[model samples]
Target: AETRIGVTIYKYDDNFMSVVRKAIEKDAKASPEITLLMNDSQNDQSKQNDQIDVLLAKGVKALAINLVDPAAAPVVIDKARSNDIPIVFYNKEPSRKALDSYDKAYYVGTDSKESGVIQGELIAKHWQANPEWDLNKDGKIQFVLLKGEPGHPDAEARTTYVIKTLNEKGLPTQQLQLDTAMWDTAQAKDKMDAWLSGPNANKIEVVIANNDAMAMGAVEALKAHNKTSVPVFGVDALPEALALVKSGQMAGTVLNDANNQAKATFDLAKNLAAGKPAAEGTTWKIENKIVRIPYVGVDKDNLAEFT
Candidate 1:
């Protein structure tokens, strides 16, 4: 039987959209008869639920979702369950409480918390190496945090764990600013520009983003402010982020490789449609455990490696 796979994600941004497209194409090739329904949620929780409802009405054999809010998204999981459709969650796990109400759903992605830890460690090490680069000016390191959507798991795990890691490393965060950015590049740019114009302008040593688009947006703001020399870090080594790092306009990015995560879930969808079981517990008991590329801190010296 031809498998119908529905992919519901945050939005069609450059970072994740590109990956989702590639995964769809890859799956189409791997399974010639596969039909895909790609939905762009625009980072809205309610919209994602609606998309899932539409996919369900369309009778997709399986579903792959990168949730906007793990908790709010469970209703769709319940709907899929009622339809006897196998669903795979990518990147973020459904909230534990929600999971208790649902069963047999597959989770196939990385530990976003760990990604934040890596970024935090990188910032801490850098501050330690450059003792003079203190934002607090009190023998402590400080930086700005750029977060994603308010209720999203990435925002929660990335912000919480990264700050925890920084605290453990004795890093002080002034939180120059935080935005519930929809992961939109232009919004990130505007938010950063506003931060630069505010009271603490030019005093920030670093900018930490939940994903590369936000980082690149911050870079744009820096260039506009003639402070492109500032170090900025983020998750998801998106092609644009890699290009910026290669050109020395940005510091580094956590190479989460969203393409691989999408592809893994796509494969799971095919297996489920075929009435075959997915991998053990939909991963090795670590909330999916998809490909987690190392956080290669890119500077001029290692630019070529990333390219």
Candidate 2:
């Protein structure tokens, strides 16, 4: 008997999410009895809604979602509940009220606040290590931020906690500028180009991007402008970012634990597709309908472990 599990990612080509895709695909391959009908949401709520409708019509046993529209969780839950289908929500966390709306719905993702705190620690360490990056001779650190999607949970949590944690580490900070890039490397680079040419260009003591792509993009812009003095920190321990960390090009990054998250999402979906408890065949923490993956800070001193 073949069973289908519908899958939709907010965006397919996002570096970290791409890794999650491969891991999910691998798990799907291992269980040939299950068919993964995957779709690209293209960051459109309407498009994702249409895809969900199609999957429901096709009689999918369960749903795996990297939600495109964070605000549409209630609608998605309603659909799933009406159809009696289990849903495994990943990446974009559904609010407690949304997850509580349906017994069969669950969320799997990182603790963004924790990750943000670690990134701030990474920056604090970098600021202490390098004195020349402070251009103002003032005792405070001035930095710029490259945020992810405007309303994304990770974006806000990362932005809020990173700055809070940095200040908690006794580093007084000033925000030079903040901009959103929708988590695209090219857009982040474009933002960097503008920042470098602006009045506060030289005064930017640190650069913090919500993810590695933006951080790498900022690094590219710094190199192009021949400004290598300031340290840039980002999230996601992408290979390129790790390489940059090892070589001391980028400041540091945080590990988002993609494999663990994907496996949890895939395994939970598989369990529900089999008409069993969502955690029946797995040993995972499912507190408050959310499975949280841990985050780790990566720097040159401990770069070898991640590589």
Candidate 3:
């Protein structure tokens, strides 16, 4: 009999998550004994819980989830604990207490702060060679940020650390605007369109986004004004974003290693589904109930490597 794993995602439209889910699908394909069932949470906490309940009802041996709300972990942990099912949480992690609430539960993903720091490092390198990036002739780089879901762990950490990294590197920076784009391309573009029409818009020197979708959105907004000179930095080296980086339209992006992340998630889930240790026969290890994958920075110079 094939072991079944239930997978739930934060949303379907997210470019990075789409890559991850597809990779997970592929991983399941190669595992003849693994049968995967998946669902979209649509960024709604209630919907996510509902999906999890449905999957659990179907008697899946294990669960993998990208939480719509990290706060929901404790409750989900209890649910899984009652069912005696192993669960692995990815993308968005829950609180420490929640993870410990059930020993059978775990988390897998990269550190948000690392991605932020890498993004800042990428920009610092670009600015060193191209002083013309500072369009306002100001000593500080003026940036407008496109953020992900409000209160999301990754959203907060990535935004906070990116600015912190720039300042710690002795680069003065000014945040002209920071708005939540909800990780949508069109939403990011709309934010930019409004900002571009603002009086101080000309002072904008750089664009930073929590993810590639929003970064591409900022690029579209700039295209509207026939402006391609502004340097934009984003996370998630999506194909479109990579293309933009190669063409000099984007400054840089951080690669979240979707393949590795998805593989780790699948392998761990598969192991647990087979009544084995989370890391049994795999290189992955659970440290403090979480498995962290490292992030990489990608720029035009070495862009082909990722391509």
Candidate 4:
């Protein structure tokens, strides 16, 4: 008997969906009777909440979520608790403090700290390989960072974690200039181009975007201004990012295994549906902070593996 699970997904156009689809295919039986409740948030939190409510009403045994709002994730968590449905939070952590109150499993797709560490290391290595200018005296490695939504966890972590690691490694953190484009490449490019025209014209050593789209945007933006020396670093090894890395246009990026995240969520949902104990019962608290962090790291040299 296949476990019927409901997934409330965010936008389908994003890289996150690729993994969700992969999990569905990998876990679904030949004639899989499982009912998958999918939704496109359109980047709207209210719409996402409405979708979650509809899925809950559909009577799914388990719920898998990639939240639209990290903090407000608790709202769904609380609702699931009242319905006695086990929830599996993915990618982003639920905003609520009482996350395990719903009695569910959590699978984290990326570790922000490590992702930052890898980015910092990659930037350092790039500098080592190309040391034409004195980075120490001139702070040659300047940056234009495009962060995700202001409050989102990924945005927050990627910002601080990467900065801290870079500083720890003796990299010149002073050269980094952060500008928020609200996760939109158009906005990021427009804002970045404006900054380029000012005192920092064509001086950006690297462009660090929260995701691949932004990185590509930075690349295009720099090229538009006759400045292409700045390498772009971003997270989520999306298809284009892979190609860019191969063609040697971008610097590097981290790949979040969303497919694996979906598989892990499916496994937990399947187990719970079968009335089997999910995890050691302690590793996953029936009513506590149940964070199931998945694997994350850099794939610079091996970016082709995923491509």
Per-model C-alpha RMSD:
3.1, 1.1, 1.0, 3.3
Candidate 4, residues 1-307: lDDT per residue as tens digits?
A: 4456777666665554655666665665532766566667777778888887888787778877777777777787777778678777777766545465455655445556666677777777776677752333575456778887787677888888777777777776554468777766687788778877788765566777877777777777788887776677877777787788887778787776665566666666656655576654324333343444443444456765777
Q: Rank the candidates by TM-score, best first.
A: 3, 2, 4, 1
User: lDDT per model, in order?
Assistant: 0.73, 0.90, 0.89, 0.69
Model 2 lDDT at residue 105: 92
What is the full ranking by lDDT, best candidate first? 2, 3, 1, 4
Expressed as tens digits, the lDDT of each residue in 142-173 for candidate 3 is 89999988877778888999989999888899
Angstrom error at residue 9, model 4:
1.3
Give the TM-scores of the predictions, in the order they appear. 0.86, 0.97, 0.98, 0.87
Better of 1 and 2 by lDDT: 2
lDDT of 1: 0.73
Each candidate structure's count of clashing pairs: 0, 0, 0, 2
Q: Give candidate 1 regions above 4 Å deviation.
A: 135-137, 280-303
Tens digit per residue, CA lDDT, model 1, 22-106: 7666766867788888888876878998899899899898888877777765777777998788777776567656655555577
Please report the TM-score between candidate 2 and the true structure.
0.97
Off by over 4 Å in 3: none
Q: Which portions of model 4 miss their true places by more than 4 Å? A: 1-3, 29-31, 133-140, 279-300
